Design a protein around this ligand. Sequence first.
Ligand SMILES: O=C(CN1C(Cl)CN=C(NCCc2ccccn2)C1O)NCc1csc2ccc(Cl)cc12
Lengths: 27, 11, 251
Amino acid sequence: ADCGLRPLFEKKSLEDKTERELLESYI
Amino acid sequence: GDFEEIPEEYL
Amino acid sequence: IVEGSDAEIGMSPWQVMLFRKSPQELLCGASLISDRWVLTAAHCLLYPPWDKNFTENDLLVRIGKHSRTRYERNIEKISMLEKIYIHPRYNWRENLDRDIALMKLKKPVAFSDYIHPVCLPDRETAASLLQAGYKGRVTGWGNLKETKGQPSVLQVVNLPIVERPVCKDSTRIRITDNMFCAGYKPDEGKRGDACEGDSGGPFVMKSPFNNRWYQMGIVSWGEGCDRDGKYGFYTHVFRLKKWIQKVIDQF
Ligand SMILES: O=C(CN1C(Cl)CN=C(NCCc2ccccn2)C1O)NCc1csc2ccc(Cl)cc12
């Protein structure tokens, strides 16, 4: 119910050094 | 044998 | 992990280490699906060819780690196993098909900033995120090269999903459906790959629909770490969904 979301990232609206790469690939 | 020693309690 | 890069603290709160009681050593990675259920590659407990038939009382789970050797105190947790559930039709004889397996922890661990469960896909999420070209993220403590040697802290490398045809043509094994291969093409210029020591490792993808991280595959088998013309193979989790929810909505 609260899976996926990360305490020190998605819960503090912070992106990790290389996650945008993933997102950018979903053309 | 190169890692770290874990407390017996767990073993 | 090969050609990856040191992970950030709290980047994979679902990473699980399959530590062997004696002799104490690494074995396989794993993800935390629930608060009392771990998911790892089946050939990490059962593989006759190597006389590898570990039982529950033979291993220990370790959540909340980042360092591979030190017992990261106050942060990590070590929960014993209460029962190993392997897929009854796990073909370890031919091509490691249905190489999935579940584990029930005796006592439910407590989440934290470094320990959080991962979502399992559904028919939809997997129906859109599982496409050639898209990138997934593998994480592990395994070797740093097929032949330093091992990282000091959990490695992480994002990889691109490869077409079905490319997988088959890049091997002699019969590729079922419970598996897809990810990796870079010899010309793509960029490298990376899983490797000995990443088995069971969680292969996830962040959903661009709800910012939630979803695990699609499970590090299974490979043919050389970061070898050109070859790719790594993971268990197509979603398919084996029916077996998962069943094993859980029962015991
Ligand atoms: O150590 C394993 C699992 N195994 C076993 Cl038990 C046996 N044989 C393997 N390779 C040969 C292909 C094969 C033969 C028979 C059945 C299935 N595959 C294999 O591969 N995986 C870790 C690994 C090393 S390099 C590598 C690259 C990518 C990925 Cl996903 C995993 C790995």
